[PDB]
Every structure is written in structure tokens, then in C-alpha cells.
């Protein structure tokens, strides 16, 4: 097998996909000779969509885990070639049969210091009282858990989550919520001073203040999650995407992921290549998992599709 076009990569956009160009694709193709093209709009329903159709332009897909979770038990993915992804490295877990566990990423609370300057707890988010332009992500996912910790439920008891009660709880300021958003569009609103209160990725949070964003952030009420590289079914390079795989879930492109964004890297080997530093900037360090929870991919794989259909309906 060889390229003969470009290996498509469908991710989030903005910061992260910077990141990932400047860790993974642009370092791939050097190493490889391939051409490499990132794009965005990578999510369950687009995937559904494309494998469903039988014209996939996509490669390779960066997928969270509620995503990764929806797309294996819809059968959309390729079985990953584990006699070319060869990272004994990355633990075992992380190793599943449809997809790599490349990165470990926080969600965060995070506010505009100028705006609060004794900062936002998440019982401050989800109370009405507190007055300030609020942004949820755009799925479900990430906004039960967060409204749930933000009403005192302990990260410990967190699943099977309570969905009436996280709804309910997201009610109290939904008038105050200015929109339920994807990542690339919550930073730009940081940025621009269009929002006062985010929940968003850490690397997001972090980017936005290095680009001059005056917000702070803490890991009370975060959520911690995997995302994976996976290929979707009837990939036409589905061979080249296990190349780039491999490459790319090695110790020193993993380093360089964490090295321009604040996410974590799976491989083990990774960390010794960064800054010690870095460490307390993931979720994993102890003194930041135990103020959050983890994503239970297995709550959501059983549950997305009746927590999405209200949802929508919710939003709208
Ligand atoms: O793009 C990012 O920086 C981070 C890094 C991994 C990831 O899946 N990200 C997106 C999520 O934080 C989030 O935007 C999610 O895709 C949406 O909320 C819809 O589920
Ligand atoms: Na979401």
C-alpha cells in the first residue's frame, strides 16, 4: 500500500487541529512522504452519515469517547491493524479493537477574571443570581455531567446520571446560556469577550489566555476524557490511516501534542519528554482529578441516543 492522494483527518478545528498539525500531520507526512489533510466536523452522526452512504472522504477521525462509543456500536469503524500500530507503550486499554487512545483531555469551568474576579465555583455557574454570559458545549455530553457536579452531586456518584435533574438544573440559567457550542467556537468567544462563563477543553481555556484572553479556570466540576484516532469504515486508505496511527501514538509526537496543548498524552514514555510542569496542567495529576470526574463511556454508550433525541428538543 502507498498514497496516491492526500490522507484525510477530520478533527475539531482551530487550536487543537493546530496542535495535532503541528504534532502529528505535518510531522507524518515528513516521515512518510504522505500527504496529509486535515479537516473538520468529525462526530457520530457525520460519520453515521458518510460510512452509511458509502462515499467516505475520511480517513482517519480524531473521536471523543461518547462519539467513539455510538460509532462501534453502529459498526462505522475499521477494525484497527495492531500488526502495524505497534505501541506497546500506550497501555492496553487504550488499545481497543476499533480505535487508539491518543490523548486524555479535561473540560473545564472557566471565567473572564475582569468580569470575576473571586472567580465562578460551578454552583456560581448553574445559579441564577450570578449574572454573566454563559456557553455549554453543543452536545449533551460533558453539559449533564458539569450541571450535575454544579448542583452538588458528588463526582463519586456522578453515574448513572440523573438527566431530569441535570436539565433541571441547566433550566435555572438557560436564559443566561447565549449557546451550547463546539470548541473552536467557544475559544473564539473567549477571545472576543462575546461569552463571561465557558465549560471547554483545558488546551482550549489555556490557548485562549496565551492569545491575550484575561480568564481563569479550575478544575472543580471538570470531566475527564479519551479521545481516539479511529478509521472509518470503508476508509479509502484504510491501510495508510493504520500507518499514520502508529506514527502518531509514538512517545515523541505525543510529547509534542502535549507541548502546544494542554491535553495529556496516553503513551507512558511521553511524559519524560516534557516540561515536569505540564503534569499539573492534566486531569490525571491527583490534586486536579479528585475536584472532577471522569466520562463513563459505558453510561453513555447505553444511554446517548434517548439523552440526544431530548436534548435537541431541549436546545431548541
Ligand atoms: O477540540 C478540543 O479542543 C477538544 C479536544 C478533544 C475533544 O474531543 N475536544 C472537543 C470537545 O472538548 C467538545 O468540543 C465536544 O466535541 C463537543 O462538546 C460536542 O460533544
Ligand atoms: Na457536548
Same mark, same amino acid.
Given at each position: 500500500?502507498?498514497?496516491?492522494?492526500?490522507?484525510?483527518?477530520?478533527?475539531?478545528?482551530?487550536?487543537?487541529?493546530?496542535?495535532?498539525?503541528?504534532?502529528?500531520?505535518?510531522?507524518?507526512?515528513?516521515?512518510?512522504?504522505?500527504?496529509?489533510?486535515?479537516?473538520?466536523?468529525?462526530?457520530?452522526?457525520?460519520?453515521?452519515?458518510?460510512?452509511?452512504?458509502?462515499?467516505?472522504?475520511?480517513?482517519?477521525?480524531?473521536?471523543?469517547?461518547?462519539?467513539?462509543?455510538?460509532?462501534?456500536?453502529?459498526?462505522?469503524?475499521?477494525?484497527?491493524?495492531?500488526?502495524?500500530?505497534?505501541?506497546?507503550?500506550?497501555?492496553?486499554?487504550?488499545?481497543?479493537?476499533?480505535?487508539?487512545?491518543?490523548?486524555?483531555?479535561?473540560?473545564?469551568?472557566?471565567?473572564?477574571?475582569?468580569?470575576?474576579?473571586?472567580?465562578?465555583?460551578?454552583?456560581?455557574?448553574?445559579?441564577?443570581?450570578?449574572?454573566?454570559?454563559?456557553?455549554?458545549?453543543?452536545?449533551?455530553?460533558?453539559? %449533564?455531567?458539569?450541571?450535575?457536579?454544579?448542583?452538588?452531586?458528588?463526582?463519586?456518584?456522578?453515574?448513572?446520571?440523573?438527566?431530569?435533574?441535570?436539565?433541571?438544573?441547566?433550566?435555572?440559567?438557560?436564559?443566561?446560556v447565549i449557546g451550547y457550542k463546539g470548541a473552536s467556537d467557544i475559544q473564539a468567544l473567549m477571545q472576543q469577550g462575546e461569552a463571561d462563563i465557558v465549560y471547554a477543553g483545558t488546551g482550549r481555556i489555556k490557548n485562549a489566555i496565551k492569545a491575550?484572553?484575561?480568564?481563569?479556570?479550575?478544575?472543580?466540576?471538570?470531566?475527564?476524557?479519551?479521545?481516539?484516532?479511529?478509521?472509518?469504515?470503508?476508509?479509502?486508505?484504510?491501510?495508510?490511516?493504520?500507518?499514520?496511527?502508529?506514527?502518531?501514538?509514538?512517545?515523541?509526537?505525543?510529547?509534542? %501534542?502535549?507541548?502546544?496543548?494542554?491535553?495529556?498524552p496516553t503513551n507512558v514514555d511521553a511524559l519524560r519528554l516534557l516540561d515536569p510542569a505540564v503534569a499539573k496542567d492534566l486531569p490525571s495529576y491527583p490534586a486536579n482529578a479528585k475536584l472532577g470526574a471522569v466520562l463513563n463511556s459505558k453510561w453513555?454508550?447505553?444511554?446517548?441516543?434517548?439523552?440526544?433525541?431530548?436534548?435537541?428538543?431541549?436546545?431548541?
Open positions: 500500500s502507498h498514497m496516491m492522494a492526500d490522507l484525510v483527518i477530520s478533527s475539531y478545528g482551530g487550536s487543537f487541529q493546530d496542535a495535532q498539525t503541528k504534532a502529528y500531520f505535518d510531522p507524518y507526512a515528513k516521515a512518510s512522504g504522505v500527504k496529509v489533510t486535515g479537516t473538520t466536523g468529525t462526530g457520530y452522526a457525520k460519520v453515521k452519515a458518510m460510512v452509511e452512504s458509502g462515499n467516505v472522504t475520511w480517513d482517519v477521525i480524531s473521536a471523543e469517547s461518547p462519539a467513539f462509543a455510538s460509532e462501534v456500536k453502529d459498526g462505522l469503524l475499521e477494525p484497527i491493524d495492531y500488526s502495524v500500530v505497534k505501541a506497546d507503550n500506550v497501555p492496553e486499554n487504550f488499545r481497543t479493537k476499533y480505535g487508539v487512545g491518543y490523548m486524555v483531555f479535561g473540560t473545564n469551568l472557566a471565567w473572564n477574571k475582569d468580569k470575576f474576579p473571586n472567580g465562578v465555583t460551578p454552583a456560581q455557574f448553574f445559579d441564577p443570581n450570578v449574572k454573566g454570559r454563559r456557553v455549554l458545549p453543543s452536545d449533551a455530553t460533558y453539559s %449533564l455531567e458539569f450541571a450535575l457536579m454544579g448542583d452538588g452531586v458528588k463526582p463519586a456518584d456522578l453515574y448513572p446520571l440523573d438527566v431530569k435533574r441535570a436539565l433541571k438544573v441547566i433550566d435555572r440559567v438557560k436564559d443566561q491575550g484572553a484575561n480568564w481563569s479556570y479550575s478544575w472543580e466540576g471538570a470531566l475527564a476524557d479519551t479521545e481516539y484516532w479511529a478509521v472509518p469504515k470503508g476508509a479509502p486508505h484504510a491501510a495508510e490511516a493504520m500507518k499514520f496511527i502508529n506514527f502518531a501514538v509514538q512517545a515523541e509526537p505525543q510529547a509534542e %501534542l502535549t507541548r502546544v496543548i494542554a491535553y495529556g453513555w454508550n447505553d444511554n446517548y441516543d434517548a439523552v440526544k433525541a431530548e436534548w435537541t428538543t431541549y436546545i431548541m
